[PDB]
Structure formats: C-alpha cells, structure tokens
Design an enzyme around this catalytic site. Structure first.
Site, short mmCIF file in Angstrom:
data_model
loop_
_atom_site.label_atom_id
_atom_site.label_comp_id
_atom_site.label_asym_id
_atom_site.label_seq_id
_atom_site.Cartn_x
_atom_site.Cartn_y
_atom_site.Cartn_z
N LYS A 50 0.80 -1.22 0.00
CA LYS A 50 0.00 0.00 0.00
C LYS A 50 0.85 1.30 0.00
CE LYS A 50 -3.11 -3.29 1.47
NZ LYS A 50 -2.87 -4.55 2.22
N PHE A 91 13.30 -5.09 3.54
CA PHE A 91 14.42 -5.75 4.21
C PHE A 91 13.90 -6.59 5.40
CE2 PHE A 91 17.08 -4.31 8.05
CZ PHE A 91 17.98 -5.36 8.04
N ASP A 96 12.01 -11.74 7.88
CA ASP A 96 11.00 -12.26 8.81
C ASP A 96 10.27 -13.46 8.20
OD1 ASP A 96 11.63 -10.20 10.59
OD2 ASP A 96 9.74 -9.07 10.31
N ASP A 100 10.05 -17.08 10.00
CA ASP A 100 8.84 -17.77 10.47
C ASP A 100 8.25 -18.73 9.45
OD1 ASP A 100 7.23 -15.95 8.89
OD2 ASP A 100 7.27 -14.54 10.58
N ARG A 105 3.17 -13.43 0.99
CA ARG A 105 3.37 -12.05 1.40
C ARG A 105 2.71 -11.18 0.32
NH1 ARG A 105 4.26 -8.96 5.59
NH2 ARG A 105 5.75 -10.48 6.41
N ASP A 167 10.28 -11.04 20.01
CA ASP A 167 9.22 -11.84 19.42
C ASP A 167 9.59 -13.33 19.32
OD1 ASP A 167 6.60 -12.08 18.40
OD2 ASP A 167 7.23 -11.62 16.34
N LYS A 193 9.24 -3.80 17.51
CA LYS A 193 9.19 -4.46 16.21
C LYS A 193 8.35 -3.71 15.16
CE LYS A 193 7.82 -8.75 13.93
NZ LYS A 193 7.75 -10.23 14.01
N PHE A 232 -2.84 0.45 16.12
CA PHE A 232 -2.77 -0.19 14.81
C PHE A 232 -2.56 -1.71 14.89
CE2 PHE A 232 -0.43 -1.48 10.88
CZ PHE A 232 -1.40 -1.18 9.95
N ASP A 236 -5.09 -4.70 14.03
CA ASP A 236 -4.67 -5.63 12.97
C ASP A 236 -4.81 -7.13 13.39
OD1 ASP A 236 -3.08 -5.59 10.19
OD2 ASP A 236 -2.03 -7.04 11.47
N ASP A 237 -4.60 -7.41 14.69
CA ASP A 237 -4.69 -8.76 15.27
C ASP A 237 -6.13 -9.22 15.32
OD1 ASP A 237 -1.95 -8.68 15.56
OD2 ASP A 237 -1.97 -8.54 17.75
O1 LIG Z 1 0.64 -2.48 6.11
C1 LIG Z 1 -0.51 -2.30 5.45
O2 LIG Z 1 -0.80 -3.01 4.49
C2 LIG Z 1 -1.45 -1.28 5.91
C3 LIG Z 1 -1.17 0.02 6.14
C4 LIG Z 1 -2.45 0.63 6.66
C5 LIG Z 1 -2.82 1.91 7.12
C6 LIG Z 1 -1.85 3.05 7.13
C7 LIG Z 1 -2.26 4.20 6.42
C8 LIG Z 1 -1.45 5.35 6.36
C9 LIG Z 1 -0.21 5.35 7.02
C10 LIG Z 1 0.22 4.22 7.76
C11 LIG Z 1 1.46 4.26 8.42
C12 LIG Z 1 1.90 3.16 9.17
C13 LIG Z 1 1.12 1.99 9.22
C14 LIG Z 1 -0.12 1.95 8.57
C15 LIG Z 1 -0.60 3.06 7.82
C16 LIG Z 1 -4.16 2.06 7.56
C17 LIG Z 1 -5.07 0.97 7.55
C18 LIG Z 1 -4.66 -0.31 7.12
C19 LIG Z 1 -3.33 -0.45 6.69
N1 LIG Z 1 -2.69 -1.54 6.23
#
Ligand SMILES: O=C(O)c1cc2c(-c3cccc4ccccc34)cccc2[nH]1
Ligand SMILES: O=C(O)c1cc2c(-c3cccc4ccccc34)cccc2[nH]1
Lengths: 343, 343
Positions: A50, A91, A96, A100, A105, A167, A193, A232, A236-237
C-alpha cells in the site's frame, strides 16, 4: 485523502530509484550480474504493498515545509526518503518471512520461496537495507539533516531487530508456551518491532527534512506516534480473525501459526484454569477443527466487545495526545495519519 | 610483531564493548531478554578468531597518530573501531554460514546449527551489524571523523553484499556450472566480498581517526590494500588443499563444496577438453574418491608451481605498490600488514 493525492507521483518515482541504484555498473561493469539481481529483488519486494509508511514521509513533508521551499529538488528528496522507509520495510519482511517459514506475502509467494532463491534471500534482504544509505548519500549528502536521517534509519533498524529478538524468544518454534504471552511482553514487541519504524520513523524523517531537529519536538511526536502504533497492531490482530477479509487483504493464520496476538493475550488474562487448558490444547495447531475451537473460545470470552471498549478509550486518548503534544507541529500531521488507522 | 604487542589490550577491551552494548536495558527493562540474547550472540560469534582485521585498526592508529595525541580516550576509540570491524565480520560469517549450509566455523559448530538457534541467526546477524553504529555513536559521535566512519562501514557492508551476490550467482547450489568460473569473475568476487572489508576498511578507519580524510590518500591506500586482498585470498585457496593444516586451522572442503577457488579457475584455463570433462565429473562431489581425483588433476597441471610463480611476481609487485603509493603514510603501515600475509 491527502495520501491518494501524493500516491501516483510517489509510485512513479520508483523507476528513478531503481535507475539511480542500478547506475553503479556503469564504471564497474564487473558487478553487472549482481546489479541485475538487485533490480529483480527491488522490483519483487519493494512493489506490491500500500506504500503507506513511505507516503507518510511525503504527506508530512508537504504539511511541515513552507509551500515556497517545496521546490522540485526538495520533493525529489522527500519521495526518496519515503522510498527508503519502504526499503527498510522490504528488508524486514524478506528476512522475517524466512525466520517464520511464511508462504505468502502481499498476495504473492515469499521471495525466499521462489525457485532458485531460497536462503540466498538473506543477502537480498541485506542489499535492500544497504540501498537506504546509498539513496541517502546520492540525494541528501549536502543537506544539513543528512546525519540525522542516517542515525534515524540505523536506530529504527536496531529497535525493530530488538523487537524481532523479543518476538522470537516469546514464541519459540517447537517450544510452544502461553506463559510468555503477557500484555507487558506484547506491548514491548509491538513498540520495538512495529511502532518505531511504521509510525515514528516516517514522521521523524519528514520533521528533520523540515529542519525540526529538536529533542523535545521528537520526544513529543514519538509519544503520539508510539500510541498510534500500539492501536494499529492491536486492531490488525483483531481483523486477522474477527474482521471480514473483504476490506483487508489477509486471513486468520495467527491461531495456526501460534502468534503472540492481542486476542490470545486477553484470552489468557480472562481465563479460568479450564478455559486455559482448552487454549493450551488447540492453539498453534494446523488442524482445521482445532483452529475453529479457539475462535469459539474468543467469542465466549467477550473479545469482540473487549476490542470495542479498547477502540473507544483509544479514540479519545489519541485525540488527547494530539491536543497535548502536537504543538508546534500542525495537528493535521498526526490527524491525517490517525484517520487512515482509526477509520 | 606489533600485532602480538597490541593483542592483549584489544581482546581485554571486548568486556567493555559487551558491557556498554548491554547497558541499554537499564532504562528499558522491557527489552532485557533480547539484550541477554545479544550478549550470547556477541560472545559466541565475535570471539574465537585471530582478530587480525580489528588489530589492523589499532596497529595502524599507533603508526599514523603522533605519540603525544595517543591519549587514554583516543586509544579506547581505536580499540572500539577495531571491534566494529570484528563485528562487521561476525555479521558476514553468521549469515554466509546460513547461505552455504556450513557446519563449522573457527573450529566450533556454526551459530545457526546450535540447537534452538536455526534461522533465528538471521536476526542475530542483523543485530551484530546494528552494534557497529551503536558503538560508533557511543564512542565517536563528538569526533570530526564520525560521519566518515559511518559511511565507510556502510560502503564496506554494501561492497561485501555485492561480492556475496556475485559469489551466489557464480556457484548456484544445485545448478553446478564451471563455465562461470573465470579469472575476471574470481577477481571481482575477491575484491568485493573480501578485499574491501578485510584490508581497505581497517586501514581506512585508522586513517580517518588520524585526520587523513583526503580522497587521493584513500585512493592510494586502496590500490595497495586491494592487491594485498587479492594475494591473501589466492594464497588461502591454495592452503585449503596444498597447505599442511599444521600451520592453518581449516582443511580442503572447497572441492566437495564446489567453491570458485583460484585453483579450479587456473585448472580450467590450462585444461584440454578431456581434462575439463574429468573436473566436470568429480568437482563438487561428497564422495571421497571423487575429491581425491581433483587433487591429482591439480598436481598434474603444475598448480603448486603456478602458485609459486604467482607468489614471486606478487612479492615484487606489492613492494612496487608500497614504494609508489604509501606516501604520505609511513610505509610500515602497509609493510607490517604485508609481513603477516606474505610470510
Ligand atoms: O501495512 C498495510 O498493508 C497497511 C497500512 C495501513 C494503514 C496506514 C495508512 C497510512 C499510514 C500508515 C502508516 C503506518 C502503518 C499503517 C498506515 C491504515 C489501515 C490499514 C493499513 N494496512
Ligand atoms: O582470517 C584469518 O583467520 C586469518 C587472518 C590472517 C592474516 C592477517 C594478519 C594480519 C592482518 C590481516 C588483515 C586482513 C586479513 C588477514 C590478516 C595473515 C595470515 C593468515 C591469516 N588468517
């Protein structure tokens, strides 16, 4: 959003990054074969995500620097430093996935799993890391923030590596133990991490590029960004299991992979001796039936409700953190990032 | 020799290095378990070698800096930068042993082969690399050469990684091909994977610490040191087979491991179509009989004599390189190093 606005220019700049990094075999034709392999490693691993971490540098740059000082050259530097963050992540991911035994990916097969690659991917991960410092020298050597950026990328690699060590010690492959899965341990793993490189590094890089090098300003920005990082990863978990994968791009491999998830941590805290024994027997198992039993136990222990009450307290708290610690930075620097994470 | 004189003080300083690197868990007790693992990784991997690369920094420091400026503090910095070279090597060895499936290193089992370690050693190798930049900040942050040292360690990691990529592409495990084993390829592998970090890096680090930062001086020192690096690796490939292991601390695993050795390269150059077919059939084989056939072919093709005529031309040439390019540095800087390698 301001992220979608900057995306196209940022993703278009990758071609330039690859060109400048592969422009080393001009005077040294002897290493040409290695440089071709570096190009293939960049194209496979730095592309397909992304680009959110890298775009955060560019978005924050636009908001921190006066429009008048945002010339052609300064923007090129912002897109490069944004790509350095994306390379630092590539990297980490490549390596990682080796450690694991990951299979996929970003929807595609892990680089190390590709035929003819294997454990050669360790050198490939190292090269991805080396590219950061090459790009910083090529683009920023003459800038008053050069050293700050080098030290920031080095400190972030170090913190992430300490997080990864933590971890690995918590979840040893073969030595399955839930006793190690504490909230204090989970929060330290997430902070080292994930939170430093994903949240603090891109804003901090943008801050130095704007001439904001003060320790108090960096400490303030870090207090906000580390809490955003905790939320975040916790969110995510949850989405790994309790989240409809229509929105996301991954599914619940955490139970079968025996990961130290925020869910398994809360499950342990709110567990009776009998409830713990059920988890002990089913968690980390490849068997479909066994994975299904953990999901049912999580639902029983009010974990989707526990996560909602966490979200509620977190929404107010990050707003309090921005209110108290954003000054002198524009609060939109943190708000634009929080909107993407919290909504 | 001047190396044996400086050894004890240098090896005693390791305790200080470990103490200062493990003094991170004082304010951050949360990462204590990871710091204990870092200590174990340092003790197993940075200790047990000859320390020649690291001592080269200290010896060169003593010869480049005026005795009056060689105070308590400056010596501590020289021993630390010497240990940074030793850590850079530990990082390379740990990782290379994973990539080529090595069983032993410095007489002991490879770190990754230790029970409970395995592929976790990738993170361990990364930590060893991170320690360099931590030590440079802890000891040299306030020095006018700080940035030069950071850039030098980064460029040397990059050159070694390019060398390792080149090596992996030349000798792919499973895709056994002798066509790739050319002198031009061998010399590039040796230059990038070995000569830069083993010979140029320690002297170059000592030079910057002495305030010798000139590009011409560094280019001159590099011309001498890269040739010393070529000779060393060529001599080391010979000793792997034709060298009585009483003197050394390793034996002929290069034939069975299918390595791009200087011997197999010369063997190919001086080969008739029939002689090549024999090599094609026996080289890279685990079978004792097959390994014995290659040794016999090397002896037949005057390879111990070919190596002697190479040594002869090399002795005169490095003396010519020192004569022409050592100034303004004391020629003993290069001579003390050449004595250890050429005798
Ligand atoms: O790692 C992924 O695929 C992912 C990234 C994000 C983010 C996100 C958006 C903007 C800046 C960020 C900076 C650090 C971490 C995450 C964000 C918001 C929702 C879901 C996501 N999934
Ligand atoms: O790597 C080993 O074990 C080893 C090191 C050496 C050296 C040597 C001595 C002094 C400085 C050096 C700097 C770079 C490389 C090698 C040296 C001389 C002979 C045999 C060796 N074996």
């Amino acid at each position: 959003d301001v992220y979608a606005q900057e995306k196209q220019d940022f993703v278009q700049h990758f071609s330039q990054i690859v060109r400048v990094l592969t422009e080393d075999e001009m005077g040294h034709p002897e290493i040409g074969d290695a440089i071709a392999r570096l190009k293939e490693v960049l194209e496979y691993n730095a592309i397909g995500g992304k680009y959110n971490r890298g775009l955060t540098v560019v978005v924050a740059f636009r908001e921190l620097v006066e429009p008048r000082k945002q010339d052609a050259d300064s923007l090129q530097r912002a897109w490069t430093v944004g790509w350095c963050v994306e390379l630092l992540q590539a990297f980490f991911l490549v390596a990682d996935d080796i450690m694991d035994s990951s299979l996929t990916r970003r929807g595609q097969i892990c680089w190390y799993q590709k035929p003819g690659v294997g454990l050669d991917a360790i050198n490939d991960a190292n090269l991805l890391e080396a590219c950061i410092y090459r790009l910083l020298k090529l683009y920023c050597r003459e800038q008053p923030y050069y050293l700050n950026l080098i030290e920031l990328f080095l400190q972030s690699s170090y913190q992430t590596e300490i997080g990864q060590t933590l971890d690995l010690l918590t979840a040893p492959q073969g030595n399955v133990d839930l006793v190690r899965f504490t909230e204090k341990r989970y929060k330290s793993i997430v902070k080292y991490k994930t939170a430093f490189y994903s949240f603090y590094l891109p804003i901090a890089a943008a801050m130095y590029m704007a001439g904001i090098d003060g320790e108090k300003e960096h400490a303030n920005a870090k207090k906000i960004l580390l809490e955003m990082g905790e939320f975040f990863q916790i969110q995510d978990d949850y989405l790994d299991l309790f989240g409809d994968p229509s929105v996301t791009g991954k599914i619940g491999t955490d139970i079968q992979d025996n990961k130290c998830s925020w869910l398994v941590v809360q499950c342990l805290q709110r567990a009776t001796p009998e409830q713990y024994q059920i988890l002990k027997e089913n968690y980390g198992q490849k068997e479909a039936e066994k994975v299904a039993r953990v999901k049912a136990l999580y639902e029983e222990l009010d974990l989707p409700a526990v996560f909602l009450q966490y979200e509620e307290d977190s929404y107010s708290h990050i707003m309090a953190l921005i209110e108290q610690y954003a000054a002198p930075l524009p609060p939109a620097v943190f708000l634009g990032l929080a909107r993407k994470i919290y909504k």
